[PDB]
Amino acid sequence: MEGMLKGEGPGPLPPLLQQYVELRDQYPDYLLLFQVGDFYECFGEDAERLARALGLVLTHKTSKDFTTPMAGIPLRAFEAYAERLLKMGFRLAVADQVEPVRREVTQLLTPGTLLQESLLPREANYLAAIATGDGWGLAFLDVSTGEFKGTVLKSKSALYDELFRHRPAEVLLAPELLENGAFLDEFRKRFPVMLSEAPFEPEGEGPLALRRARGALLAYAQRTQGGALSLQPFRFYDPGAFMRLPEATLRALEVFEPLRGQDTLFSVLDETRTAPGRRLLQSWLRHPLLDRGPLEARLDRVEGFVREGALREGVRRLLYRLADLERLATRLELGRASPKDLGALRRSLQILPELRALLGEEVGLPDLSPLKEELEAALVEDPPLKVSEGGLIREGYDPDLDALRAAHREGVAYFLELEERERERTGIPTLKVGYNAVFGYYLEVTRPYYERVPKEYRPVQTLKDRQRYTLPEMKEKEREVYRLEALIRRREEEVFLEVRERAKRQAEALREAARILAELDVYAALAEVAVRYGYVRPRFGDRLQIRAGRHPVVERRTEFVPNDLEMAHELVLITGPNMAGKSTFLRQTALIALLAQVGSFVPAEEAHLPLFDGIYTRIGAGKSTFMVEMEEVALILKEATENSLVLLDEVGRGTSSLDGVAIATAVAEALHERRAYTLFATHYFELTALGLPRLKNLHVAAREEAGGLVFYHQVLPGPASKSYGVEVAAMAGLPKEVVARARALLQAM
Amino acid sequence: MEGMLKGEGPGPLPPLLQQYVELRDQYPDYLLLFQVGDFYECFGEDAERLARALGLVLTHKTSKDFTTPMAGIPLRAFEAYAERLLKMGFRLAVADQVEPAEEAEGLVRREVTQLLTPGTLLQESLLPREANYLAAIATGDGWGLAFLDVSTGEFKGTVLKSKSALYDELFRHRPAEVLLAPELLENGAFLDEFRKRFPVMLSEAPFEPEGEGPLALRRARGALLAYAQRTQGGALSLQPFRFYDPGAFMRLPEATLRALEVFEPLRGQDTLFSVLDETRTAPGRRLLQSWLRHPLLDRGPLEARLDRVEGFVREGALREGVRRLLYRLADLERLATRLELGRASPKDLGALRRSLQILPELRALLGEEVGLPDLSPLKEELEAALVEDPPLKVSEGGLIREGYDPDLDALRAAHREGVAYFLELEERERERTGIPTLKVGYNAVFGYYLEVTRPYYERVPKEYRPVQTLKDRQRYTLPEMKEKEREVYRLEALIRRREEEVFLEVRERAKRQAEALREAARILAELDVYAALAEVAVRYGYVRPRFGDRLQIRAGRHPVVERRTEFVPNDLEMAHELVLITGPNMAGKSTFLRQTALIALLAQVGSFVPAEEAHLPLFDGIYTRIGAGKSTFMVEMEEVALILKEATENSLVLLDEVGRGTSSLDGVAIATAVAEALHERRAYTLFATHYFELTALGLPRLKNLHVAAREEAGGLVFYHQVLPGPASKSYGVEVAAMAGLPKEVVARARALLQAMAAR
DNA sequence: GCGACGCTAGCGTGCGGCTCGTC
DNA sequence: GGACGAGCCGCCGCTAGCGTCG
């Protein structure tokens, strides 16, 4: 309700609450955080919301004709609370007091539009918009980076995969999608991301669905940033031009996220030193390449750093904790760079010369020494972006500012002398000089010396154990001091703005530097990983031949038994007992293929790999488990080509015996005919004898050693000759009698 | 070593910081809250911990010698802050000022008054309605397991033969804190197993035996008593120790409690307990939970519980009346304990009086036979002693009513007269001086005073003694006032004393009835449960179950699922039979299994059940292997083993697709051997499976049931009706086609099926 | 030949109570 | 000329620093 506040009493709202309600109504989609002193406050129903969400203590804001509930949080703890509130589904509108009893919204906090470094992860934070037309328009925006890109997908499936691959923090759905109760529930069940409203008026040229999705991002984000956004050129892209990595595949392979128990492929490759670099590597992983040319070039760069140890080590040492120049450039362009930002920037530009001396001219790094010297001359060594927005420009930089401060230092020195002269003249070694916004400059005497205070003194305020007096010659000195403090804050602000502007003019140079370094960062990190964990440079061809391949994530935890693999558009069945590494073997094959097509060396002794058009998996655990799996099998059968890598794990399970085998056979045959590279781990000895021309068998076995049965992870040629289902049951502690019947029945069958 | 506070600067440690550091080191695993005035403070790293843990401002305590970090919280909101600290995983050692500052040989006396740990909480605001158990596990002629609920005095334990049974006994109690015997802490392999299965806080306590009986139990009990007496800061209030036998009740393994979502949900969804519980009091919710934790095996007591339930189902007016009255009943059991332990607050006495005023009304409804204690005499003293709405602390406003205690009334009277004096003074001086706006005011810093504004400064009489100068006002003092002020202060100080003395005297009056309070609490808790189960029965349409050796359920339903969706009722007849249920998934086979266990669970708790009619046997335990070693196959085989070793002819066994996870033949073979053993065992077994092969075994007590899917206008429609006989067709391929498998692949699969099946 | 105390401002968690400026 | 922002003083107990007894 507009202008209405929840509480008791008649009378209109007092000034403070009126100002609050007015602001609160200009942003109905957000929780308004109103600054009141050292706190951010919410009133009425909003207080109750903040209180319950954060477990705060509800109080009251009372005036003569109205009393309303109240809850707030300390300014000092803002970021911490904002983060929780954002994660909790809240959208925040921040109203701060405008420097010299007047509040204004300074920030509009939304999960997908965050611009504060402190509330962001190193990785890209995307805002995504979806709209219809000829197919699906999908567009992404990273306000902190300016990254702006999109595409058009023909099927809902492809859309969902493109969406998932980017893990957006917030989604804007077109009106025809928000009204579609069918889509909405399907969408909310699959993507538990915050959904926000936005007008989908078209923008720019191209497919209408894209023009619209793009219109929504811009309109919504501009609102969040209170005006013009700082975006890089919108980039249209074709998912079809890269290796396909559906959601199911990304999850099963734990590329970016763990299924259960930490450690992902990305964490193992987590060796970059800079945020732009981590971002770039994530970008490459997200969309692996299909073209040999660019891949071979990337591999050369990595090989370069592997051979040039001193250089590699030199670069990595220098990039350590280097500031995110790309996001800094964005904060500058938007007129939001803080004094701290400029401090971080000058520090970064002091490292730049070192990187270039090491890297050389061909690298193309910009020379920003002029900017560096300016920041070195202008800023205090530790810019107090927060300490007051003052005490920022160092002495010596600006003459007008220096003169004012010097005038001020004398005023302060004056009162220091006034104090000494007075405690010598009065004999009160305790006599003090202090200032207060209310009484200004005064003299202070403790209770024990009240009878030594001269009569010239005019008492002005009495406290518990002391009293403050005044002296005729003190007034003019006070107001002059206050006059100077105002002039100083004002001048120092002007200088900061001028300094900040000079840094702003170099924004493109900053982005260019950030980009070149991000690449260097990635190549050097892939090289370090390769050298550190023993990775080799892959070679591309039609046949897949891997010697001593290992699962890159798993081997970092235990001693890994490497395995070989040779495939060429074949249906490879892997029989044998579970707990023998069959699953990890399928996954490691996929990870080596993914790494190679990203331009990284791989965990093997030798690896000849084809350039897959995609990796499709059916691995791991209202709709039953069987139907979920059949749905995944359906997508594989519909998307896999002769150039796809397909990984199936126990496909066919979860139903009756016969239907189960009939299904896996039909699926196996379809894949055998598709000419895809298929690794099918199964228990169906029956599939092992289909006799199709490109059908190949492999298996793992177990041996009842000292323990009673030890599963060997060595992948062996030919099909499994034995079944250990019963033996495992016997090992599980199932009654000997029951184990015996099973064997009897097993053989009897 | 330890005895040094973190902080920069050389020199010694200030006296206070010494008194602080001394106590701190005494409780290495607790966060010490050191009372200093109206704040509980922490120094050094501990101040750092506290500050970040609660997001407090981090200051410092400077002294010539050196300065150290400092963080603190006002005593006002102690419990609120502790609540937070507790939930973060901290243990708290509370050090208060034991000696009034008004008389201390320098440094105020400070000692640890109590420890706050998850399993020994006594504060109402830090406790859940449910029982809060401290548990202790030890060895010594079996596995000793003992529990203590310090807030109620519940004190019980038992000995178990295996580790499996120990763990299950522990789980059904969901302890908040566990004390492990030294040997178990020493046993590295045990500890890890324990930590993984039980994420609960582990604490240290000595395990010197206490009392008589099995060593293991005497040790666990000793641990509970040594630990709780320490935390409580004194002698505990305990109910007679109960050495019970879990074998005397229905067995409910952890796997079962979890699979049936009795107390905890699997997917955020409701719980049997959340649905069943409409209890009005905490003692009642606890009693109901206790009954669910250990369902009975005895027909007689069960029929008695059902009689009381049925009685409240019929007598609607009485049922709603009792529930209306109970709604306002405080927790008299926990109130009794606080009374006995000398912790009862003026707030507790208010709640006590309110409850005792309800007592006679309930007695009037249930009649003079429930055995409810007559406590009107205590009620009257409370009514005559405390103001209508009692304050939180005796130190402030009037806790005690006027006319109750003469000493106090004499004191208050003189205070009223002392205050009137100043009001009269303001009027006397306004006329004497002629300054109309003159005022007599007061503030804690200057005391009472005369106030005149700037326009009358040259009008102030010579007698006025300047006291406080303000911007445009000046305050003075007259000799007569100084005297009177000191008087008002003396009265105020005497009033706080006498009033606290009266509170304590009244509290002691209540404490003497602690036992009657517990007794009234037990009776009402039981009635709360019976009326509550009747309430649920009437609201959801449940019926009274009959006990026999045959299980005969007509139109039964899952009591929880039906709560959020239209449920299709189903029948079931079973008599020590192996019941196989074939058919596709998504047709309610699992729900059918679970509803069976829940109906049986509810009946053995003395509750009506969700069905049209239910004839039920008395099961000795419910064993499940539903949903959910390293391999999936191996894990399920382990569960099956436990089931085969504990299952009896009186057990209800629920198997969900046992045999999955391996090869064709091995799967069917294992499923068969398991089926035959359970058939031989004669337990009541419901076995949901896809194996048509199991439907034709040569077993005399094997019965077939199934669910079916229907290929209609939509594609495939699953029917939740449980049908007689085995499935006549498989729907795997159809479901696959429904999942989107391409037509030709589905077609090829059908062709393969018809060729295979065609031998 | 300086240890023992007397007296008393200063000081700071979170934040009540009190002041002051404005209208 | 009452009512409403807005911001400071002190709390309660301990201490350093003096100002002295003997």
Side-chain angles (χ1 to χ4, degrees), chain B residues 15-16 38 64 97 107-108 110:
Chain B
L16 181 64
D38 300 306
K64 182 176 182 182
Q97 292 178 169
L107 202 53
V108 178
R110 295 177 194 180

Side-chain angles (χ1 to χ4, degrees), chain B residues 232-244:
Chain B
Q232 205 287 306
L236 303 168
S237 176
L238 305 151
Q239 279 301 93
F241 181 84
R242 286 214 300 130
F243 180 9
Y244 68 96

Side-chain angles (χ1 to χ4, degrees), chain A residues 459-590:
Chain A
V460 187
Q461 177 178 49
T462 311
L463 293 70
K464 177 198 183 62
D465 51 302
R466 62 274 215 58
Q467 209 170 183
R468 299 166 182 171
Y469 310 77
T470 294
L471 231 44
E473 251 301 307
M474 290 172 71
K475 193 58 195 300
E476 294 199 76
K477 270 60 187 58
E478 151 175 41
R479 293 185 289 197
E480 184 50 33
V481 172
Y482 281 48
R483 186 184 77 78
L484 290 176
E485 301 181 325
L487 298 189
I488 290 176
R489 281 188 304 277
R490 219 186 305 167
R491 178 60 188 165
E492 180 157 36
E493 186 163 307
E494 316 186 322
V495 180
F496 165 69
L497 272 54
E498 271 161 29
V499 173
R500 178 213 248 174
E501 175 60 8
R502 296 177 202 293
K504 182 171 182 296
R505 297 169 198 158
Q506 294 307 322
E508 290 306 305
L510 293 183
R511 287 179 178 289
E512 179 69 0
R515 184 189 70 60
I516 293 177
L517 295 180
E519 265 204 289
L520 289 179
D521 189 17
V522 171
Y523 292 140
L526 289 177
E528 168 62 12
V529 159
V531 168
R532 184 189 301 189
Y533 309 133
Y535 288 8
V536 173
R537 167 164 186 164
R539 294 289 145 62
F540 301 110
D542 185 64
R543 316 172 63 96
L544 179 159
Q545 309 186 71
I546 302 184
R547 163 148 64 73
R550 310 106 53 182
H551 186 117
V553 182
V554 179
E555 71 175 355
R556 292 301 105 211
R557 298 149 28 175
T558 47
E559 283 177 58
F560 200 91
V561 176
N563 269 300
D564 308 317
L565 181 54
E566 284 203 64
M567 285 192 87
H569 303 280
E570 310 174 86
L571 163 63
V572 185
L573 296 171
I574 310 181
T575 40
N578 295 99
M579 291 172 87
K582 297 207 292 181
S583 175
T584 290
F585 181 68
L586 296 198
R587 289 188 299 251
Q588 100 177 197
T589 307

Side-chain angles (χ1 to χ4, degrees), chain A residues 115 230 325-338 341-342 345 371 375 496 499-508 510-511:
Chain A
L115 198 75
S230 177
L325 263 23
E326 175 172 34
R327 278 178 176 154
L328 210 155
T330 300
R331 289 200 295 293
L332 280 170
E333 294 152 3
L334 287 177
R336 292 182 194 187
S338 67
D341 283 335
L342 300 189
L345 176 60
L371 211 208
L375 300 181
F496 165 69
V499 173
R500 178 213 248 174
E501 175 60 8
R502 296 177 202 293
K504 182 171 182 296
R505 297 169 198 158
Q506 294 307 322
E508 290 306 305
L510 293 183
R511 287 179 178 289

